[PDB]
Design a protein around this ligand. Structure first.
Ligand code: CLA
Ligand code: CLA
Ligand code: CLA
Ligand code: CLA
Ligand code: CLA
Ligand code: CLA
Ligand code: CLA
Ligand SMILES: CCCCCCCCCCCCCCCC(=O)OC[C@H](COP(=O)(O)OC[C@@H](O)CO)OC(=O)CCCCCCCCCCCCCCC
Ligand SMILES: CC1=C(/C=C/C(C)=C/C=C/C(C)=C/C=C/C=C(C)/C=C/C=C(C)/C=C/C2=C(C)CCCC2(C)C)C(C)(C)CCC1
Ligand SMILES: CC1=C(/C=C/C(C)=C/C=C/C(C)=C\C=C\C=C(C)\C=C\C=C(C)\C=C\C2=C(C)CCCC2(C)C)C(C)(C)CCC1
Ligand SMILES: CC1=C(C/C=C(\C)CCC[C@H](C)CCC[C@H](C)CCCC(C)C)C(=O)c2ccccc2C1=O
Ligand code: SF4
Ligand code: SF4
Lengths: 75, 146, 142, 78, 68, 74, 142, 30, 220, 150, 81, 75, 42
């Protein structure tokens, strides 16, 4: 799940996520719950940084669970 | 203009290979063609549509031709639940010998492909009964394409 | 020559900066403009090079920082030795090391998760470890 | 007690979280920079507001009638 | 003899420029330029920040609605 | 059966995406904000915030709990 | 109008061991650029195509294959060493064209007498929607 | 019989003439 | 089981709609760029300023949409096949229990039903199913090439070509051949389109192979 | 062996080497000025040392994982299949990452600390000047191996 | 003309775009519509590479220098070979 | 060590080389290239230089190591 | 003393303290009323 999750950050771009954030922000203005640290999308080099990090975490852990459970049972 | 693509001068003078890639993707976008006018915009679309019907009729004349030249259609009718419908024949000169045996099935003489598009049942229902109905079925659609 | 000249009390031990987030950087210190601020706080936490422009302070920070990294490892080691002593079948493992799995973690039974306590044998139960400390503690004659 | 009773139990709680948080943001809204009072939460002010979520169904429903639960066309900036 | 034009100072104003970042928002007038040729006189300061970080810009007289 | 039902759904998945895709090209190239003054079409550009957010809500509510109940079952 | 350009002579280029970032076949067919500057002291700088070469006293000359490269060095010289520079464009046949200051004055400050090519005297929000330009050679900005 | 002729023609020749035909047309200049 | 899957189906339609509907209504303009209409349906981006504007064209909204379409239709056809493949065997209990936890779908549908497919050819022999076994991997290969164009963006490859276009210009016997059209890396939008073409093709061929081979292997 | 090696570099008494002078004798015809000047750029920049240390410590971790599975050093480690697989896998990953780190900090040094007017080096200069050759040749091999391995 | 660079009337004459053009496109000309009495101008759009940094440094309401990407030439593509 | 081992040893020689290529390119071209002549001035980790000159996404040395991680994860 | 309290009031430190209390509470309830699939009081 984490591995497949990282793809959302690598494939897509920031300018789409910034705009969708704006519409979400508007609804909070309606109910007065708009925060004062203005919401922003992640910076360009952060979208990548989060993208690679999850991808590595999903890939390595999958092998981790694949190896230990296999070898422990057969020896 | 002055070269491929004939329909977009801005792309034509692009010296890099970008022109070739972009001369293919923007072929059918008739609005952004240079010198387009609202009369041309429709008349190209109308001519283009007839091009798309030609493909559809030529495509369906392919299916009838093979099913009635390399298929099990007359035999499949005789027992629909035990004769794999046949799509066409295989002639691939890379095949070794054990593959030639393996892909020979459906009561054919050489390798074949089993048809999973379900044409065999549809033509059974709507009344076709031999090969010969299919051949004229091929010719007619071929004529309609013409 | 080679000697030991150090300084005395460069930076005064105080809690003020602990309540001024982003004190280290001049840009971050002004406050949280947007949520972009709370990401740049961690991205430039350890970049001692960008905080100041001279080698002396960068040195003293990396030198002291390593001590923290060194300290955590010792704390990590301490747990591993402690855990192997209070929650392990080590002494049982020393009898038949061929066919008793090394176990040094035991979970509390809250939500059924005691099924994790495997029958690693040796009259014990628990998560079967694989870091191989037990062969290390035997090779040192513990 | 399978869905409806646990469900109402949630909706009570969910507003309590929702209604309290709204009160705080409004409470600190009128300050020199509301930015600082959200990354460094005011604990005392959040303590005199933490129980006001006990009666959120009553309080909110009066706001809706009085027409202060929402705004109309003044959205960004102020 | 002619009095200064536009709002004086501190008067909250509702922004009316459509493409601005603070459309339908409110800012504070910090100074109005009294040169007739100046094409965007009213210097408006805001409380939020636009995507560039800027928090002020000029504006035209008919794009400013003087709320009170 | 399987090769047919699966075939037509994927065709339908592609075609349905095109319908919105040429909706966007409409708003760009051929829409006219004067000849459509306040009619039903211009209003769908007037409360675009209300449409977008609620779509975001319904997706979020389905996402949290469909996945939620699933991990719990797992 | 006092704008007689500099009229490039043939001077000696800087000492350099040569690198792989020099001109390519584009120079022999399309165009290549030279940037002539005068130094008071023989120092060492860094070349836009990587590596370091040493400028020598007085009139230098150096050829680069683009315009971004001539200026990229042009900023470094004007900034680091407080030194003047032009650059040109050289055609395959041999006709050389004066490029950079274009008036004798850097484009940052204002000369009374240059043109106004490329301006719209209206705010950006007032452009015409794409329906108003269809089937014409116009664009919204044009 | 007939496949052994038509398979190569559409697999080898008809591609070759096609690629070489387009390559001249794409790379023309007038 | 059929309750939980249907919401997963329902989740797909809203989220897929959300991207497309967000794309359509913001095509004319939005706060990040209130004159988006002056650039057309498809443009790469608007530069790094104002915080970066990658993937802003209404084109890109269609772009991200296809991924959720393939996933959504993935969850639909998956459901139809497994429910029927248990029925046709008369083993309807297997779906009705395994289909409530994810490992049930991964173990009892994917892993279990692909036993006959992957043996299309082994160091012992081949079968009729070999062609579907080959296409199965061929599906995995194109799909995995798709990532290369989505993740690695243009500016890296462009610097790579320039070195190459230098090496070719200095190699003897090979400086006698000159490109007519200069070589450049694909454009930003082209890579997205190309990258999605591989992803879709590999995603159809992979499933289409597993769907036919697994069912036809048992013909039941 | 280590202890004797400790007594090499001059510290306060007469005996011992000078790390500066060792780097200033190896200069060759193809290389020009040789390792002159590397003493500075390896002394007034932490990002140089961190990049250089990371590669060696990165590489050593890998060699550790190749030896601990072939010369089992602890008793009853051989027949512990759970341990052998994990220990070999663990240090490969650790070794892999640390090498990548050596690329990042070497890259950071080129941007921040490198300066050819004061900390001038000749080898690091020559390496920059023919970088088009280095990548293109490494590009061809990666293609050659790509076709003949996969 | 390779790319089209357009400068509007909002511009406040700050000379931040001109200083940020890496290939010397824009330049400054006198005006009378600002306090600074100068507005930017783009008389050399041929060499305009398209690097939007020219207008990531225009500090106005929306923008006062705008860049529209058209067809690409051998210099507007920044080819060195 | 038979044939089946010979192939896989030449797989490792392949992924190691490719990983070296990405990281090595980043180190050398971290200050300048024929595309961007003043890349050094832009810092160590910057997203891009805009969509000009065909598109300059991911030219910063940080994005070369960002790419290397996958191949390190691959090798 | 004031600076210590302020630091303890910054967002991350409250989070672990708040969530930690929340985790303890839920774990206790599940220890006393386990399996809890329905709400059988009314
Ligand atoms: C027998 C003497 C001795 C010993 C055992 C160590 C041992 C160590 N030194 Mg060290 N060091 C020594 C003398 C010694 N040093 C001297 C004389 C100097 C000054 C020239 C240093 C300067 C030094 C630095 C600057 C650093 C170490 C570090 C370290 C640690 C690496 C892990 C290790 C504990 C590193 C460390 O982990 O610091 C916490 C580190 O960064 N040492
Ligand atoms: C949502 C239910 C839940 C709760 C309340 C806890 C709570 C706790 N777990 Mg736990 N755990 C959970 C689910 C949960 N876990 C799951 C799903 C797994 C499987 C991966 C584990 C596996 C696990 C191992 C260990 C804990 C441990 C613990 C305790 C200290 C940390 C803490 C009481 C530790 C103790 O016991 C410990 O060693 N947990
Ligand atoms: C006081 C807190 C608060 C309140 C009242 C709201 C209210 C609202 N949000 Mg919301 N939101 C918040 C915080 C809050 N938000 C935070 C912190 C985030 C970032 C994760 C979001 C992200 C978010 C999204 C993405 C969306 C909403 C939406 C909505 C609207 C529909 C309700 C909904 O879907 O809930 C959404 C609930 C969540 C996303 C759960 C996260 C909220 C956390 C758990 C609450 C935080 C409370 C705060 C930290 C406590 C302060 C205590 C104080 C004493 C210190 C509604 C106007 C939706 C909308 O537009 O519908 C119209 C929508 O799409 N919000
Ligand atoms: C019968 C229905 C139909 C019709 C008439 C069209 C017709 C058109 N579409 Mg369209 N489209 C359709 C279905 C249809 N499409 C579907 C089902 C989808 C969803 C996948 C799309 C998605 C789509 C997008 C995203 C875009 C178009 C565009 C276009 C226009 C230009 C196409 C072009 O030049 O590219 C022809 C392309 C090629 C020759 C190469 C494509 C290679 C593919 C991968 C082949 C496989 C053209 C008017 C484009 C447009 O107007 O550009 C401004 C545009 O951006 N459409
Ligand atoms: C594992 C893969 C994965 C997952 C889990 C998601 C999940 C999500 N995507 Mg997504 N996406 C993916 C792959 C994935 N995507 C890929 C490959 C692409 C193509 C690039 C996209 C493109 C995409 C777009 C374009 C959009 C989404 C949206 C969404 C959200 C839909 C609302 C929802 O169900 O949230 C439910 C919440 C969760 C699933 C989070 C669960 C994790 C836990 C609960 C968090 C806390 C754990 C501690 C959700 C966060 C849409 C969105 O924002 O919706 C409003 C949206 O606009 N994604
Ligand atoms: C002991 C070894 C070591 C040390 C001392 C450092 C130290 C540093 N690295 Mg580094 N790095 C290392 C290993 C190391 N790294 C390795 C192995 C890699 C490869 C993965 C990298 C890749 C790397 C990159 C790509 C970057 C750094 C950066 C930095 C600097 C800022 C770090 C920061 O603020 O992060 C704060 C801590 C975090 C954000 C925690 C992240 C949480 C993880 C994902 C879980 C700092 C000097 C940055 C820098 O100097 O930029 C100028 C930078 O851009 N490093
Ligand atoms: C499965 C996915 C996949 C594949 C096949 C490739 C393939 C390649 N990548 Mg790559 N890449 C991928 C995913 C993939 N990548 C992803 C996800 C990322 C993001 C991290 C990258 C990032 C990346 C970088 C950063 C680099 C590469 C490089 C390379 C190339 C070096 C290998 C080589 O020369 O082998 C040759 C090609 C193959 C082995 C492909 C299979 C070819 C077989 C043997 C035969 C093909 C059919 C044959 C031609 C017959 C034609 C039939 C006719 C009808 C046309 C190669 C083209 C490197 C490169 O190009 O420089 C050398 C490089 O620098 N890639
Ligand atoms: C075949 C090429 C042999 C290469 C060889 O034996 O090099 C030997 C050659 C020797 O250089 P010098 O003897 O001048 O350098 C003396 C050293 O002490 C450093 O100054 O090194 C080079 O010039 C760089 C060549 C690297 C070539 C790397 C190819 C991979
Ligand atoms: C209950 C029932 C019934 C009924 C049913 C119904 C009535 C249904 C409905 C349904 C429906 C009712 C559906 C719908 C759907 C829709 C859709 C699917 C949509 C689409 C849309 C679109 C695609 C759009 C587009 C666009 C855009 C985007 C923008 C503008 C332009 C355009 C328009 C193009 C009956 C009685 C009969 C029978 C029994 C059962
Ligand atoms: C009965 C029932 C059911 C049904 C249900 C339904 C159908 C519902 C609907 C519903 C709806 C249709 C709703 C609507 C809504 C709307 C709105 C509009 C709302 C609003 C709200 C608000 C506005 C709130 C706010 C707040 C508060 C008050 C608290 C928290 C905070 C805040 C501020 C957020 C079922 C079958 C499931 C089951 C059985 C039971
Ligand atoms: C999804 C996505 C986002 C959206 C993700 C965002 C905006 C951040 C995710 C939300 C985080 C989790 C904030 C929530 C945490 C807050 C501190 C609130 C805490 C309250 C909790 C205790 C509930 C981007 O910004 C982005 C940027 C560039 C490339 C790709 C993407 C991208 O794919
Ligand atoms: S895009 Fe670049 S070249 Fe063009 S004007 Fe802007 S800064 Fe200058
Ligand atoms: S990274 Fe690429 S897509 Fe993003 S802003 Fe830069 S040029 Fe545009």
């Amino acid at each position: 799940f984490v591995w497949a999750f990282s793809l959302m950050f690598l494939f897509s771009g920031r300018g789409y996520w910034q705009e969708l954030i704006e519409s979400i922000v508007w609804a909070h203005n309606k109910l007065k719950v708009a925060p004062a640290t203005q919401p922003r999308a992640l910076s360009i080099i952060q979208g990548r940084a989060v993208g690679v990090t999850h991808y590595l975490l999903g890939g390595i852990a999958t092998t981790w669970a694949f190896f230990l459970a296999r070898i422990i049972a057969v020896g | 203009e002055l070269r491929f693509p004939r329909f977009s001068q801005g792309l034509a003078q692009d010296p890099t290979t970008r022109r070739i890639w972009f001369g293919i993707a923007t072929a059918h976008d008739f609005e952004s063609h240079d010198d387009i006018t609202e009369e041309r915009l429709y008349q190209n679309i109308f001519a283009s549509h007839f091009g798309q019907l030609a493909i559809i009729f030529l495509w369906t004349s392919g299916n009838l031709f093979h099913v009635a030249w390399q298929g099990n259609f007359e035999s499949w009718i005789q027992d629909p639940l035990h004769v794999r419908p046949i799509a066409h024949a295989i002639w691939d000169p890379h095949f070794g010998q054990p593959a030639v045996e393996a892909f020979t099935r459906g009561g054919a003489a050489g390798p074949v492909n089993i048809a999973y598009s379900g044409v065999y049942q549809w033509w059974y229902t709507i009344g076709l009964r031999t090969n010969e109905d299919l051949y004229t079925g091929a010719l007619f659609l071929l004529f309609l394409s013409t | 020559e080679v000697k030991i000249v150090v300084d005395r009390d460069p930076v005064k031990t105080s809690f003020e900066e602990w309540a001024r987030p982003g004190h280290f950087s001049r840009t971050l210190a002004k406050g949280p403009d947007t949520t972009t601020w709370i990401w740049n706080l961690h991205a430039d936490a350890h970049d001692f090079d960008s905080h100041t422009g001279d080698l002396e302070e960068i040195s003293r920070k990396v030198f002291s920082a390593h001590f923290g990294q060194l300290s955590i490892i010792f704390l990590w080691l301490s747990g591993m030795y402690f855990h192997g002593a209070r929650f392990s079948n080590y002494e049982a493992w020393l009898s038949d090391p061929t066919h008793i799995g090394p176990s040094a973690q035991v979970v509390w039974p809250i939500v059924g998760q005691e099924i994790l306590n495997g029958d690693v044998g040796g009259g014990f139960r628990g998560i079967q470890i694989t870091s191989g400390f037990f062969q290390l503690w035997r090779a040192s004659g513990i | 007690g399978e869905f409806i009773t646990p469900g109402v139990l949630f909706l009570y709680i969910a507003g309590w979280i929702g209604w309290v948080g709204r009160s705080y943001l409004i409470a600190v809204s009128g300050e020199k920079k509301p930015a600082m009072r959200e990354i460094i939460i005011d604990v005392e002010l959040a303590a005199r507001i933490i129980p006001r979520g006990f009666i959120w169904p009553v309080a909110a429903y009066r706001e809706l009638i009085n027409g202060d639960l929402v705004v109309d066309d003044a959205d960004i900036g102020y | 003899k002619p009095p200064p034009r536009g709002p004086k100072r501190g008067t909250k104003v509702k922004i009316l420029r459509r493409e601005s970042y603070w459309y339908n928002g409110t800012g504070s007038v910090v100074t109005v330029d009294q040169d007739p040729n100046t094409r965007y006189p009213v210097v408006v300061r805001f409380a939020k920040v636009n995507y560039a970080g800027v928090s002020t810009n000029n504006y035209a007289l008919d794009e400013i609605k003087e709320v009170a | 059966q399987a090769a047919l039902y699966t075939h037509h759904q994927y065709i339908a998945g592609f075609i349905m995406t095109g319908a919105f895709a040429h909706g966007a090209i409409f708003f760009i190239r051929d829409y006219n904000p004067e000849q459509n003054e306040d009619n039903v079409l211009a209003r769908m550009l007037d409360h675009k915030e209300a449409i977008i957010s609620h779509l975001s809500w319904a997706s979020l509510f389905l996402g949290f709990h469909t996945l939620g109940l699933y991990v719990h079952n797992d | 109008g006092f704008v007689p350009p500099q009229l490039d002579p043939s001077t000696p280029s800087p000492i350099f061991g040569g690198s792989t970032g020099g001109l390519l076949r584009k120079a022999q067919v399309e165009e290549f650029y030279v940037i002539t500057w005068t130094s008071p002291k023989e120092q060492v700088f860094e070349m836009p195509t990587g590596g370091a070469a040493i400028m020598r006293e007085g009139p230098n000359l150096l050829k680069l294959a683009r315009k971004e490269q001539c200026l990229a060095l042009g900023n470094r010289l004007r900034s680091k060493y407080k030194i003047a520079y032009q650059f040109y464009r050289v055609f395959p046949n041999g006709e050389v064209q004066y490029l950079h200051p274009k008036d004798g004055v850097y484009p940052e400050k204002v000369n009374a007498g240059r043109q106004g090519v490329g301006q719209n005297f209206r705010s950006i929000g007032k452009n015409v929607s794409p329906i108003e330009v269809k089937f014409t050679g116009k664009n919204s900005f044009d | 019989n007939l496949p052994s002729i038509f398979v190569p023609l559409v697999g080898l020749v008809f591609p070759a003439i096609a690629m070489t035909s387009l390559f001249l047309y794409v790379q023309k200049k007038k | 089981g059929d309750f939980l899957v249907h919401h997963a189906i329902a989740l797909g339609l809203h989220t897929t709609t959300l991207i497309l509907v967000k794309g359509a209504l913001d095509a004319r303009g939005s706060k990040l760029m209130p004159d988006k209409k002056d650039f057309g349906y498809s443009f790469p981006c608007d530069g790094p300023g104002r915080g970066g504007t990658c993937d802003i064209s209404a084109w890109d909204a269609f772009y991200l949409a296809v991924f959720w379409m393939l996933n959504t239709i993935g969850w639909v056809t998956f459901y139809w096949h497994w429910k029927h493949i248990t029925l046709w065997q008369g083993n309807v209990s297997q779906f009705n229990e395994s289909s409530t936890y994810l490992m049930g779908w991964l173990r009892d549908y994917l892993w279990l039903n692909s036993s006959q497919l992957i043996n299309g050819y082994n160091p012992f022999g081949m079968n009729s199913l070999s062609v579907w076994a080959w296409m199965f991997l061929f599906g995995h290969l194109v799909w995995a090439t798709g990532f290369m164009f989505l993740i690695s963006w243009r500016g890296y490859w462009q610097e790579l070509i320039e070195t190459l276009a230098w090496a070719h210009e200095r190699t003897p016997l090979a400086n006698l051949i000159r490109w007519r059209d200069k070589p450049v890396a694909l454009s930003i939008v082209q890579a997205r389109l190309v990258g999605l073409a591989h992803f879709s093709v590999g995603y159809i061929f992979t499933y289409a192979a597993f769907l036919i081979a697994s069912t036809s292997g048992k013909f039941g | 062996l280590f202890l004797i090696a400790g007594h090499m570099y001059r510290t306060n008494w007469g005996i011992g080497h000078g790390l500066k002078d060792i780097l200033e004798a190896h200069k060759g015809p193809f290389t020009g000025q040789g390792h002159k000047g590397l003493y500075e750029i390896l002394t007034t920049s932490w990002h140089a040392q961190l990049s250089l240390n990371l590669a060696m410590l990165g590489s050593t971790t890998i060699v550790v994982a190749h030896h601990m599975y072939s010369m089992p050093p602890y008793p009853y480690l051989a027949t512990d299949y759970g341990t052998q697989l994990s220990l070999f896998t663990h240090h490969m990953w650790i070794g892999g990452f640390l090498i990548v780190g050596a690329a990042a900090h070497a890259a950071i040094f080129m941007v921040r600390d490198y300066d050819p007017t004061t900390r001038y080096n000749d080898l690091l200069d020559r390496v920059l000047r023919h970088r088009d050759a280095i990548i293109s040749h490494l590009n061809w091999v990666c293609i050659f191996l790509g076709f003949h391995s996969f | 003309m390779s790319h089209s660079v357009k400068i509007y009337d909002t511009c406040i004459g700050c000379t931040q775009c001109v200083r940020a053009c890496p290939t010397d496109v824009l330049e400054m000309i006198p005006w009378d519509g600002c306090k600074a009495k100068q507005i930017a101008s783009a008389p050399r759009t041929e060499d305009c590479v398209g690097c939007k940094r020219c207008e990531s440094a225009c500090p106005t309401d929306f923008l006062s220098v705008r860049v529209y990407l058209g067809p690409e030439t051998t210099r507007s593509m920044a080819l060195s070979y | 060590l038979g044939t089946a081992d010979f192939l896989v040893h030449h797989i490792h020689a392949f992924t190691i080389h490719v990983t070296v290529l990405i990281l090595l390119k980043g180190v050398l071209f971290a200050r300048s290239s024929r595309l961007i002549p003043d890349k050094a001035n832009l810092g160590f980790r910057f997203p891009c230089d805009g969509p000009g000159r065909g598109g300059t996404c991911q030219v910063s040395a940080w994005d070369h190591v960002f790419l290397g991680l996958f191949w390190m994860y691959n090798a | 003393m004031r600076d210590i309290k302020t630091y303890l009031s910054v967002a991350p430190v409250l989070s672990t303290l708040w969530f930690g209390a929340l985790a303890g509470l839920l774990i206790e309830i599940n220890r006393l009323f386990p399996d809890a699939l329905s709400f059988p009081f009314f």
